Amino acid sequence: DEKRHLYEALLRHNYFPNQKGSISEIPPCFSSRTFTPEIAELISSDTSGRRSLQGYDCVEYYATRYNNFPRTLSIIHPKAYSKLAKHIHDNWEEIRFIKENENSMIKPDMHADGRIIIMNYEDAETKTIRELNDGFGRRFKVNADISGCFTNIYSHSIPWAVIGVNNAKIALKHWSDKLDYFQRQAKRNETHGVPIGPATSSIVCEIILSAVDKRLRDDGFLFRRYIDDYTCYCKTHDDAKEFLHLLGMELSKYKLSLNLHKTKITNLPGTLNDNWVSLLNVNSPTKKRFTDQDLNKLSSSEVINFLDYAVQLNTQVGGGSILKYAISLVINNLDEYTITQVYDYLLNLSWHYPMLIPYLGVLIEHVYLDDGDEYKNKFNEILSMCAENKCSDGMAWTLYFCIKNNIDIDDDVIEKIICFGDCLSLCLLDSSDIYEEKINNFVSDIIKLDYEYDIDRYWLLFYQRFFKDKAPSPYNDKCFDIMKGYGVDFMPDE
């Protein structure tokens, strides 16, 4: 069923930020499964407890981009998220028009693994044919980015996209207003912004932007929207300017604005991908298959020189995730002679760029990690860099590697982890049970601060300690008790 798959996607698969295709932003030890729709129904049915503050804060997870710029993913508190997901499920007949939006490529869709939101799920076949069909006969390409699609989207504009702005103003119940209310409750009862990473906020953004897509489609524009990025194909240059103008009016109707720095008009034919993508693939040592596995095994010189050229392209161009693309090109065609060289190169690049840290888990088995403790020092230096740069993705993945592979962590970097206080990193540290007293001191400071949003920012740590009977429930409601009684575990075993 579409409805049941939507419910299980919202809670069991796309609650945590898990929208990436190949490697996740979060280590795989964190999983939102065993959090079923029945449990969320029981949470939403709970009315006990008193909150001094209005709304709920969320666990914040800082993941670096390719330019080391932090992006704040969020894990919503399960009470507010359960209510929001239940309301989205209950009115899915009125919401599912976002599925039949041909212009939006990244939208809800029934996937095999159980998700609804997967970025870049479509294959290169249909992708290539689609951009060649859209770009045919047109000599201008328009790239326009919404400035604040996650950070300043208007929750009160959720009705305005559904029934119209004027009709929603006269009408002030409808499901869109309740969706607005629950989306506000997801983040501290704040009217602006949505948590990045869950599919509920992606559904809300699709609902808001579907009216803009419909208005642009009714004017005859050929365009594709990936989340907030619009790519339009225009026969003439005034058509590009008119698309930009009409998109500006349609975004300003819902209190949104184009990123004036990011919008650009290029001459077709450009490239189907970015230019660095073709530069990398045309220089890839693994670009041709041989159908025998011994032939397509890369040597040391090939991979080392290709990664050096990738660093050259990242410095010179820097138009995207060049290093991650090249590493994913060469990481699966390695032989056992060259594992140490590529692994040390990945260690250096991962110290410089934390987004390359998860690739260390690809070759984490072949590398003799005991050795002469040099790898322990390198991993702890990576942890120091992650604590200094305040990035949660690299620290979480490195801590996952150290816990799984029994790499020892010094006390000095544990002090830096507590000073940073990333919720997922502290969840991993609590799951190791070595550092119980420091986690206890941290959560005691959070409790004695008596701020409800401070507890909400570490609800996952508090629930992981409560579920293992290491700490009482910080809240006075029954949501944590309901989740513990039905065996909800966000750090499950295999």
3-state secondary structure of 265: strand
**Does 237 interact with its own copies (rule: CB under 8 A)?**
yes
Smaller CB separation from its own copies, 177 or 242: 242
Piece in contact with its own copies (CB under 8 A), picked from 164-172, 193-201, 235-243, 389-397: 235-243
DSSP class of 12? I
Q: Identify any residues that bridge with 320 across adjacent strands, giving them in sequence order.
A: none
Q: How far is the CB of 344 from its own copies (least distance, A)?
A: 47
Q: In the bound complex, what is the minimum distance in angstroms from residue 251's beta carbon to its own copies?
A: 23
User: Residues of 157-193 as b/e, b for ≥16 C-beta within 10 angstroms?
Assistant: bbbbbbbeeeebeeeeebbbbbbbbbbbbbbbeeeeb
Between CA 149 and CA 182 the distance in angstroms is 18
- CB of 202: closest distance to its own copies in angstroms? 36
Judged by CB under 8 A, which stretch of 207-215, 230-238, 375-383, 437-445 contacts its own copies? 230-238
**Is residue 51 near its own copies by the rule CB under 8 A?**
no
User: What is the three-class DSSP state of 21?
Assistant: coil
Looking at the Cβ atoms of 237 and 262, the one nearer to its own copies is 237
Cis peptide before 269 (omega within 30 of 0): yes
Q: Is the dihedral of CA 368, 371, 374, 379 positive or negative?
A: positive
Strand partners, 66: none
Does the protein bind its own copies through residue 241 (CB under 8 A)? yes
Instruction: Please identify, using beta-carbon distances, which residue of 22 and 267 lies nearer to its own copies.
Output: 267
Closest separation between CB of residue 138 and its own copies, Å? 13
Nearer to its own copies, 264 or 366 (CB): 264
Residue 266 touches its own copies, criterion: CB under 8 A: no
DSSP three-state, residue 441: helix
Segment interacting with its own copies, rule: CB under 8 A, options 121-129, 148-156, 231-239, 426-434: 231-239
Judged by CB under 8 A, the chain residues 153 through 182 that form the site for its own copies are: none
Q: Which is nearer to its own copies, 238 or 433 (CB)?
A: 238
By CB neighbour count within 10 A (0-12 exposed, 13-18 middle, 19+ buried), where does 47 fall? exposed
Element at 231 (helix H, strand E): strand 229-234
Number of Cβ within 10 Å of residue 23's Cβ equals: 17
Q: How many residues bind its own copies (CB under 8 A)?
A: 4
The answer to whether 276 touches 313, Cβ cutoff 8 Å, is: yes
Q: Segment near its own copies (CB under 8 A), from 78-86, 117-125, 236-244, 285-293?
A: 236-244
Please report, for residues 66, 219, 239, 336, the alpha-carbon distance to residue 260 in angstroms, rounded to integers and kept in the order given: 21, 23, 18, 49
List beta partners, residue 347: none
Contact between 36 and 8 (Cβ < 8 Å):
yes
Identify which of residues 238 and 445 has a Cβ nearer to its own copies in the complex.
Answer: 238
CB closer to its own copies, 238 vs 408: 238
244 binds its own copies (CB under 8 A): no
Q: Is residue 264 a contact residue for its own copies (CB under 8 A)?
A: no
Nearer to its own copies, 267 or 315 (CB): 267
CB of residue 483 vs its own copies: minimum separation in angstroms? 60
Of these, 143, 236, 275, 332, which contacts its own copies (CB under 8 A)? Answer: 236
Residue 261: which residues within 8 A CB-CB, separation 6 or more?
Answer: none
Segment contacting its own copies (CB under 8 A): 113-121, 220-228, 234-242, 408-416? Answer: 234-242
Query: What tokens appear for 324 in the block?
Result: 């991650």
Least distance to its own copies, CB of residue 245, Å:
12
d(CA 408, CA 437): 18
Q: Which stretch binds its own copies (CB under 8 A): 115-123, 233-241, 244-252, 276-284?
A: 233-241
Query: Which parts of this chain interact with its own copies (CB under 8 A)?
Result: 236-238, 241
